[PDB]
Design a binder for these strands. Structure first.
Ligand SMILES: [K+]
Ligand SMILES: [Mg+2]
Ligand SMILES: [Mg+2]
Ligand SMILES: [Mg+2]
Ligand SMILES: [Mg+2]
Ligand SMILES: [Mg+2]
Ligand SMILES: [Mg+2]
Ligand SMILES: [Mg+2]
Ligand SMILES: [Mg+2]
Ligand SMILES: [Mg+2]
Ligand SMILES: [Mg+2]
Ligand SMILES: [Mg+2]
Ligand SMILES: [Mg+2]
Ligand SMILES: [Mg+2]
Ligand SMILES: [Mg+2]
Ligand SMILES: [Mg+2]
Ligand SMILES: [Mg+2]
Ligand SMILES: [Mg+2]
Ligand SMILES: [Mg+2]
Ligand SMILES: [Mg+2]
Ligand SMILES: [Mg+2]
Ligand SMILES: [Mg+2]
Ligand SMILES: [Mg+2]
Ligand SMILES: [Mg+2]
Ligand SMILES: [Mg+2]
Ligand SMILES: [Mg+2]
Ligand SMILES: [Mg+2]
Ligand SMILES: [Mg+2]
Ligand SMILES: [Mg+2]
Ligand SMILES: [Mg+2]
Ligand SMILES: [Mg+2]
Ligand SMILES: [Mg+2]
Ligand SMILES: [Mg+2]
Ligand SMILES: [Mg+2]
Ligand SMILES: [Mg+2]
Ligand SMILES: [Mg+2]
Ligand SMILES: [Mg+2]
Ligand SMILES: [Mg+2]
Ligand SMILES: [Mg+2]
Ligand SMILES: [Mg+2]
Ligand SMILES: [Mg+2]
Ligand SMILES: [Mg+2]
Ligand SMILES: [Mg+2]
Ligand SMILES: [Mg+2]
Ligand SMILES: [Mg+2]
Ligand SMILES: [Mg+2]
Ligand SMILES: [Mg+2]
Ligand SMILES: [Mg+2]
Ligand SMILES: [Mg+2]
Ligand SMILES: [Mg+2]
Ligand SMILES: [Mg+2]
Ligand SMILES: [Mg+2]
Ligand SMILES: [Mg+2]
Ligand SMILES: [Mg+2]
Ligand SMILES: [Mg+2]
Ligand SMILES: [Mg+2]
Ligand SMILES: [Mg+2]
Ligand SMILES: [Mg+2]
Ligand SMILES: [Mg+2]
Ligand SMILES: [Mg+2]
Ligand SMILES: [Mg+2]
Ligand SMILES: [Mg+2]
Ligand SMILES: [Mg+2]
Ligand SMILES: [Mg+2]
Ligand SMILES: [Mg+2]
Ligand SMILES: [Mg+2]
Ligand SMILES: [Mg+2]
Ligand SMILES: [Mg+2]
Ligand SMILES: [Mg+2]
Ligand SMILES: [Mg+2]
Ligand SMILES: [Mg+2]
Ligand SMILES: [Mg+2]
Ligand SMILES: [Mg+2]
Lengths: 126, 149, 50, 119, 207
RNA sequence: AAACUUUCAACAACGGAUCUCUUGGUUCUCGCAUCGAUGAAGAACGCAGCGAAAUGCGAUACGUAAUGUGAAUUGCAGAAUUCCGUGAAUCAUCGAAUCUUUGAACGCACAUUGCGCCCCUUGGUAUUCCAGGGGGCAUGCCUGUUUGAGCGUCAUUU
RNA sequence: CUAUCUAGCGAAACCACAGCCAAGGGAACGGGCUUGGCAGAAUCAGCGGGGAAAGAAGACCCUGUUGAGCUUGACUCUAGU
RNA sequence: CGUGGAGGUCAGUGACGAAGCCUAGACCGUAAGGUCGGGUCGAACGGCCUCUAGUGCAGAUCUUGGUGGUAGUAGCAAAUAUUCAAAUGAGAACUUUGAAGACUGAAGUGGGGAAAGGUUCCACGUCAACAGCAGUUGGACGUGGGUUAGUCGAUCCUAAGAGAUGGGGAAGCUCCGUUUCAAAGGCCUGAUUUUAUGCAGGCCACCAUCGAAAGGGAAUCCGGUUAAGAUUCCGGAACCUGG
RNA sequence: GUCGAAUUUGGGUAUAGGGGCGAAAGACUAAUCGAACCAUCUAGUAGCUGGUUCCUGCCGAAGUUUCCCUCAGGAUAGCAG
RNA sequence: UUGACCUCAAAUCAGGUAGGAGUACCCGCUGAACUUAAGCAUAUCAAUAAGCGGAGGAAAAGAAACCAACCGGGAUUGCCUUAGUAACGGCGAGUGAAGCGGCAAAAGCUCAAAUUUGAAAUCUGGUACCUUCGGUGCCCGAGUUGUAAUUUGGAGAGGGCAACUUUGGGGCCGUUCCUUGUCUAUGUUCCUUGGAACAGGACGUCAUAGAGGGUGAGAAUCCCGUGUGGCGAGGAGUGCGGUUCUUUGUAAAGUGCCUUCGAAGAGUCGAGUUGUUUGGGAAUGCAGCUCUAAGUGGGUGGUAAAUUCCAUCUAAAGCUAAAUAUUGGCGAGAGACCGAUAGCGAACAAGUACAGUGAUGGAAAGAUGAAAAGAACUUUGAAAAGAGAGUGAAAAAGUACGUGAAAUUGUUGAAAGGGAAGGGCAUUUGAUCAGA
């Protein structure tokens, strides 16, 4: 159902583009949907995840857990949420890698650039 | 290697023929490209029909002298009898062939007639005027078909 | 030869500097297909041929 | 977090030279410290600051020479445009648009006319 | 590749060395040395009769024979038993051929085009698609042929006034101008009896 | 009768087949025209807090400048969270720069990190010696400039 | 000093399957087939009868419308002169 | 009959387990094969109608990889030769120290170098692999340290020879030739010091360059010093060249 | 055997493949020599040797004729499907 | 003695330019042999490989000294044909074009030879200024051994007569094209299984979007995208669409009639001979050498020659886009292709490691798991490790990591065993098992 000659339906090419996407492209690739309340409040559906966003896990074993993003590990194609961790047998704690498509953003970390992005995507009242 | 009753064959493949094998895989792509080039040339050029008016002319070689076909260009005599100069005819879309000569009054008359028809059926825009959009037709050959006498 | 050209000594200097095992923090990087120094040279095994 | 080129661009060449000397002294002190201290990464910032100061100094010097050679032909070759070698060797727009008197006369007399077939 | 398997200076060792006379990579010190080469039986060798691009790919068919097959396929579209035999769940459907109003040609939205097909009775075929979707078995699935599904109805029109775009996203549904009817669509897999929904204008233009 | 041998099964070995994977190849088609004395392609040696390589780069050395994006990089260490900002990043872009030693390779050489000459300048009294810094010195050919050569040759004083 | 036995270490050639004979017949000299003689685990050191033992697509010989080195008023040419 | 892939179809099977694999368990087919159960396993795959081929192996002294019997076998026997004790260590025929017995026997099994190697040198740590036994040892492994010159070499000279230029040959890559059929020159300075230079007094040329770490050649010795450098460092005492 | 001169030898240098070099053996020219090595032409050609991969069903040979620079090959007729 | 001129030099003189790489395609030179001929020498392979010189985005060719013989076509190139034909050929093996016809693309031209001669009207450079791919002034210089205007065979020029017709380049805003940015739909609703839902079932929504990819299993609807449109940014360019200050110029060009003319390329054409080549055959092209033209001439007209005609072009000078090629480069889209012994040699730090003095030769090598959660801790051991414990859906996934075949091997169990073993028919015995 693609119509333009400039888009490729080739699976090999798509997979290479995904796995070798640079950091800036991975920022867009790692988008998370806004929660119901945030979608109503901002007028937009999804946004690239950011390090200080608050999220709720809606898929996986950690479903229902909430926290603030700790790092957008773009190299690993994953985000790390504080207080969503794995306690190893030795007592140490390691972050659980989560994919932002499996979370909902419940509170955006806002600045001038983020507000401009919301308004450019068609957001109201920031 | 001369076996049972078969025709003698003359397959010429004793050179490195596989180094020169042209498979026209690009037949369809080249057709698309040709249509694209014709469309772009039509858009680029003035509302002008993509090809010049060609004369009617007798084919040589009695195998073909029974028929008439498009020639390269109108002779200088034909252009003069149609009332143009060669340079101006070339600028208004008439193919002019200085090499061809007129020894046949019927062909000469048919060429002068189609030159007059073309002059009556084209509108030349002013060099510095308005000349409202005149709905480019793409084929002078289709507009002025060659008819077998 | 102990009376060597500077070009030779430069090549030996480079060979000495690259005569080392793999750094251990490589093998901890995220994907890290690299297991060991596959280009390791030793004077008793393979000669540099200048 | 090191120097900023937009900040360096407001300073005179003497101030830039003095800052370059200070940064070089700082780098020397930092690499003296590196022998004792394990894994100090502050050297990288000073190295990049030295690179930035040198870049801005060269920008100022090259701009000064560009102003000196403004307008006149035969500017220095490193200030001339670097297209490809073939592109630099190609005829200018003036050349290759030169036409003979006879050609100009005949192309003015008989330009490609605009026309349409209308039937 | 025309040079595959021949990028070596391998030569036969000849007899007298207690090994097969196959050409062998020369030199030393790498493991490739002394290995068999150039042979279709050799690892790293050239395949037997390497495939050539000048193999015949397209097949010429007489225009009249092609038109005969297309006419036969069109006729088979009107035979209910053939349409049932070809999948095409037309069981609770009125007379075949199925002709619908020319208003179908002007539908712009997938929603209303689908609703029209369901109303005229193509709902079971549409649901046969969207339920036959399965991962393709074998290596074709990573050669841009990942998924397979059944064919739905072929909607045939005389003038495209939006129906083609309205239907192009419905899985399994194909559209065709009655002036150019495709055998590959009329008898998919060489099996006669495609379920065809004719618009009234297309049906009249068939003559 | 054991041991031993052989066959079969289970479990364990050896080995890496099979199956399923696939950022690779291969072939077809479409579009485009852009290397180099303004020093290319290629080579050598280097450069990171911790790298041997691959990749990147050139003593401004995994890079500087510029532009865009808008918060990372991440193996650890370190730094920052003002990060509502001329602003993170191994990001993208890339028009300004740097660009060691080379290489058609250009002062002469080159199995040498060998040996000159010129200009400006600095230090050692220093135009002459030694040293530091900066800039130069190839060949063929073209147009032009300047200085010349030849009873080749004109005029003129004679 | 080996060989030998032990501790440690530890290859290769070769291997259709294998391994007791006599005669018979058989591709006319069998380990197997036929008829007889016979025939009892598992083995060690030697040994050179046999395995028409191993090593190598016989180098002798012939064939090939396969060469090559060399020679000569072979056939056909050629540098030079 | 079977295999890879393709169009169609069974709205076929499947994480409640696809495919694969193992199974002296069952069934169908004369057979190629097909089907089922059990185990293992983890993400796909199949029946039928057709399409298509890089479609079926026992061999080819086949190719690549893997593995046997041989077989704990052949063997690890040249260079006279080892032994006692202690220490270290989990472990000592083999390491270290001591003792003893021997050998090379100055044309060395000694002390240095050239070519070559390139860090093997030295220290600390250290034994999985390597040292065809062993190993606590090592030319191994890991990490570091180490090579100091006016006088020693190179550098300079020319040797056999190599090789640009001027020229000539060659379609050309290039070949010849090395002073040749070339206008091939820097260094002295009268004078100049409108500038020690151009004009301008006047002196010398039958020619690039490369080519020797053993030929030629300016000049350094002693004592001491390091884990490892020494005609190089340190101390003292000299010498040559250029200015 | 020879061992003080047609001696031995290092390094530098020259000679390069139908070429060199040879106190001459067809010797030597990097384990390669009666023509080195490397790559390509080249998957060179082979009337010659070897191999040529599933099942079942039905039919089922020839080693003879003539011609061939033919005699280990082919054409031809015959036999076979 | 001075000043020229000509020719020849020099300068680290002013400013430039060439070389080398790449080389798929393109223009040339040079140039085999294997091979085929069932031997082989001509022939063939092949006007090919190798070698050498030289370009571009295409190259080359190209506006007839053409084809023809017709009622004539009309630059070149390419396709389909002509045609496996005419012809060549130990007339053997083999080889082998061209004209016409249909089509793709189309595009045409310019120098030399002319007295500007009432005016070198031409041009490089330097310098100053300017609105700088350049312009103007001045100054040198080049140049009459000829730089401009004018003409190019289709013509055309010089005189004479008569009018008519046409027109130059920059500004600004869009369009054309290039390179890019950004925005633009719909479920993470319920149940079951599962470690994970992206599976199944239920209910929906969007669809000009159900291409593709990602996410802990088959995801239109979770994310990126896709589809459709919108809004920008930086350039190239005059190709054109409007608007304005420029108005060139009594300049340039075209056309009718009369008249005088009408310059048109030389060691070249052509000829002989030699060699090579071609289908070109008493000689197709090319080249060497010898000979060497003409001007109502010259070339060609596919059988050598003499004679007479006819036809057709106009050589020995030159430029030119497209259709055409493209195993190289850059950017894209794909496949009934291969799926790690395959596919490039190379899916990976592959032209790498490594071998060779050298030219060169040249591998092997992908997969834990969703996530390292990469096994804390205890215990035995000098230690490697083991045994537990633990993580994990699984350790029958432990980095010697998916599955994990066979050969070959250990253990266990079963059985048999006088110089092999294995096999067929039949039954005994033991074990095992389906059907009813
Ligand atoms: K020989
Ligand atoms: Mg292959
Ligand atoms: Mg499969
Ligand atoms: Mg450079
Ligand atoms: Mg016997
Ligand atoms: Mg007998
Ligand atoms: Mg026997
Ligand atoms: Mg018996
Ligand atoms: Mg016995
Ligand atoms: Mg014996
Ligand atoms: Mg014997
Ligand atoms: Mg034999
Ligand atoms: Mg033999
Ligand atoms: Mg014979
Ligand atoms: Mg011979
Ligand atoms: Mg296949
Ligand atoms: Mg299963
Ligand atoms: Mg079994
Ligand atoms: Mg899996
Ligand atoms: Mg096969
Ligand atoms: Mg096999
Ligand atoms: Mg067989
Ligand atoms: Mg074998
Ligand atoms: Mg093997
Ligand atoms: Mg033994
Ligand atoms: Mg022995
Ligand atoms: Mg001994
Ligand atoms: Mg001792
Ligand atoms: Mg003795
Ligand atoms: Mg003694
Ligand atoms: Mg030591
Ligand atoms: Mg050992
Ligand atoms: Mg040991
Ligand atoms: Mg110990
Ligand atoms: Mg060491
Ligand atoms: Mg000395
Ligand atoms: Mg020379
Ligand atoms: Mg020298
Ligand atoms: Mg000496
Ligand atoms: Mg020492
Ligand atoms: Mg001293
Ligand atoms: Mg002899
Ligand atoms: Mg073959
Ligand atoms: Mg029978
Ligand atoms: Mg035989
Ligand atoms: Mg100069
Ligand atoms: Mg070149
Ligand atoms: Mg061949
Ligand atoms: Mg032959
Ligand atoms: Mg033959
Ligand atoms: Mg022969
Ligand atoms: Mg070639
Ligand atoms: Mg180019
Ligand atoms: Mg083109
Ligand atoms: Mg051209
Ligand atoms: Mg002409
Ligand atoms: Mg033509
Ligand atoms: Mg025919
Ligand atoms: Mg030929
Ligand atoms: Mg005129
Ligand atoms: Mg969206
Ligand atoms: Mg998935
Ligand atoms: Mg002419
Ligand atoms: Mg020739
Ligand atoms: Mg011409
Ligand atoms: Mg041309
Ligand atoms: Mg491979
Ligand atoms: Mg595999
Ligand atoms: Mg060799
Ligand atoms: Mg594996
Ligand atoms: Mg499992
Ligand atoms: Mg496994
Ligand atoms: Mg087994």
């Amino acid at each position: 159902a693609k119509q333009s000659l400039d888009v490729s339906s080739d699976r090999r090419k798509a997979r290479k583009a995904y796995f070798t996407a640079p950091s800036s492209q991975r920022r867009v690739l790692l988008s998370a949907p806004l929660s119901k309340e945030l979608r109503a409040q901002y007028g937009i559906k999804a946004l690239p995840i950011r390090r200080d966003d608050e999220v709720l896990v809606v898929r996986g074993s950690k479903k229902g857990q909430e926290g603030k993003i700790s790092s957008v590990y773009r190299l690993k194609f994953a985000v790390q949420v504080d207080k969503v961790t794995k306690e190893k047998v030795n007592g140490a704690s390691v972050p659980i890698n989560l994919h932002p498509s499996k979370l909902v953003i419940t509170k955006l970390h806002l600045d001038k650039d983020r507000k401009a992005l919301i308004q450019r995507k068609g957001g109201k009242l920031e | 290697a001369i076996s049972k009753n078969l025709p003698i064959l003359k397959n010429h493949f004793r050179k490195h023929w596989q180094e020169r094998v042209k498979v026209h895989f690009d037949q369809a792509g080249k057709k698309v490209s040709r249509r694209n080039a014709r469309a772009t040339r039509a858009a680029k050029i003035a509302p002008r029909p993509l090809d010049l008016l060609r004369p009617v002319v007798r084919a040589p070689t009695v195998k073909y002298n029974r028929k008439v076909r498009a020639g390269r260009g109108f002779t200088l005599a034909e252009v003069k009898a149609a009332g143009l100069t060669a340079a101006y005819a070339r600028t208004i879309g008439i193919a002019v062939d200085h090499r061809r000569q007129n020894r046949n009054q019927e062909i000469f008359d048919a060429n002068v007639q189609r030159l007059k028809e073309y002059q009556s059926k084209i509108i030349v825009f002013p060099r510095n005027g308005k000349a409202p959009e005149a709905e480019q037709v793409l084929s002078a050959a289709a507009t002025f078909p060659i008819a077998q006498p | 030869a102990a009376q060597k050209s500077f070009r030779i000594k430069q090549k030996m200097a480079k060979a000495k500097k690259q005569n080392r095992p793999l750094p251990q923090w490589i093998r901890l990087r995220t994907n890290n297909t690299i297991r060991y120094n596959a280009k390791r040279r030793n004077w008793r095994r393979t000669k540099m041929n200048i | 977090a090191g120097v900023k080129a937009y900040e360096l661009r407001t300073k005179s060449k003497e101030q830039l030279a003095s800052q370059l000397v200070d940064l070089k002294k700082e780098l020397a002190e930092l690499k003296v410290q590196k022998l004792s201290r394990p894994s100090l990464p502050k050297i990288k910032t000073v190295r990049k600051s030295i690179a930035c100061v040198l870049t801005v100094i060269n920008e100022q010097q090259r701009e000064a020479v560009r102003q000196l050679y403004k307008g006149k032909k035969y500017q220095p070759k490193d200030l001339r445009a670097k297209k490809t070698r073939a592109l630099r060797r190609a005829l200018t727009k003036f050349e290759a648009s030169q036409v003979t008197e006879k050609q100009r006369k005949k192309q003015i007399a008989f330009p490609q006319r605009k026309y349409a077939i209308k039937a | 590749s025309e040079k595959a398997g021949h990028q070596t200076s391998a030569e036969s060792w000849g007899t007298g060395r207690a090994v097969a006379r196959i050409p062998r990579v020369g030199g030393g010190g790498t493991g490739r040395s002394g290995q068999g080469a150039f042979g279709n039986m050799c690892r790293g060798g050239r395949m037997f009769a390497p495939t050539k691009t000048w193999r015949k790919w397209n097949v010429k068919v007489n225009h009249n024979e092609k038109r005969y097959a297309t006419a036969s396929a069109i006729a088979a579209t009107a035979v209910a038993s053939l349409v049932l035999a070809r999948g095409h769940r037309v069981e609770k459907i009125p007379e075949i051929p199925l002709v619908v109003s020319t208003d179908l040609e002007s539908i712009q939205k997938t929603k209303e085009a689908v609703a029209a097909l369901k109303a005229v009775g193509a709902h079971s075929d549409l649901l046969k698609v969207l339920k036959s979707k399965k991962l393709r078995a074998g290596k074709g699935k990573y050669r841009n042929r990942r998924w397979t599904q059944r064919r739905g109805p072929l909607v045939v029109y005389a003038e495209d006034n939006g129906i083609v775009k309205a239907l192009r996203n419905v899985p399994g549904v194909e559209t065709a101008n009655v002036a150019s009817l495709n055998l590959l669509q009329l008898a998919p897999g060489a099996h006669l009896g495609r379920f065809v929904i004719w618009t009234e204008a297309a049906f009249t233009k068939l003559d």
